Amino acid sequence: MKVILLEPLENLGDVGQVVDVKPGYARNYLLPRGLAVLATESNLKALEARIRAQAKRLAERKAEAERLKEILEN
RNA sequence: AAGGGGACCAGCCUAAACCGUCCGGCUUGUCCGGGCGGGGUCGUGGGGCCCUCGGACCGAAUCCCCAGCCUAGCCGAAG
Ligand SMILES: [Mg+2]
Ligand SMILES: [Mg+2]
Ligand SMILES: [Mg+2]
Ligand SMILES: [Mg+2]
Ligand SMILES: [Mg+2]
Ligand SMILES: [Mg+2]
Ligand SMILES: [Mg+2]
Ligand SMILES: [Mg+2]
Ligand SMILES: [Mg+2]
Ligand SMILES: [Mg+2]
Ligand SMILES: [Mg+2]
Numbered sequence: 053m054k055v056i057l058l059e060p061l062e063n064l065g066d067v068g069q070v071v072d073v074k075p076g077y078a079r080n081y082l083l084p085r086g087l088a089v090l091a092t093e094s095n096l097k098a099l100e101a102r103i104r105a106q107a108k109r110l111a112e113r114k115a116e117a118e119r120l121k122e123i124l125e126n
Numbered sequence: 127a128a129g130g131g132g133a134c135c136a137g138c139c140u141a142a143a144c145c146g147u148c149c150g151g152c153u154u155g156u157c158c159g160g161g162c163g164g165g166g167u168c169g170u171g172g173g174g175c176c177c178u179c180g181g182a183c184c185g186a187a188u189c190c191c192c193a194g195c196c197u198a199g200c201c202g203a204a205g
Contacts, residue, residue, distance in 0.1 A: 058153090102157080105154080105155065
């Protein structure tokens with residue numbers, strides 16, 4: 053069963069990553085302890101749109117700060 | 127059972143794509159979810175979206191009215 057990790061877990065996976073686990077592990081351990089969520093089609097959109105938004109708010113630093121390396125250095 | 131002969135006869139509404147709005151979750155937006163409205167309903171496949179040209183008839187199974195009918199009756203030939 054596929055889940056989306058909310059936290060990095062040793063010898064499991066990294067935060068925001070999709071991993072395969074047995075249904076019982078997800079249902080009786082990971083999910084109740086807030087450590088993951090089901091890789092449902094709803095959640096995969098929400099994860100996507102966060103990975104997307106972080107890359108957006110990153111590039112617009114490396115560009116409006118890059119605009120500063122234009123004024124300075126000249 | 128098909129098929130044939132007859133009785134009767136009638137076909138519709140949604141879900142999803144997409145659009146709009148309200149509400150709330152936190153994991154902050156191009157988010158996810160819930161409600162309502164729009165859109166849509168099909169097998170010659172149909173629908174959505176985007177271009178392109180083109181602009182009255184239908185009509186309920188709902189509602190209103192009225193014939194008709196039912197729940198009492200009446201007239202009715204000639205020793
Ligand atoms: Mg027949
Ligand atoms: Mg008959
Ligand atoms: Mg018929
Ligand atoms: Mg809100
Ligand atoms: Mg939804
Ligand atoms: Mg929504
Ligand atoms: Mg909605
Ligand atoms: Mg088609
Ligand atoms: Mg009808
Ligand atoms: Mg009499
Ligand atoms: Mg008499």
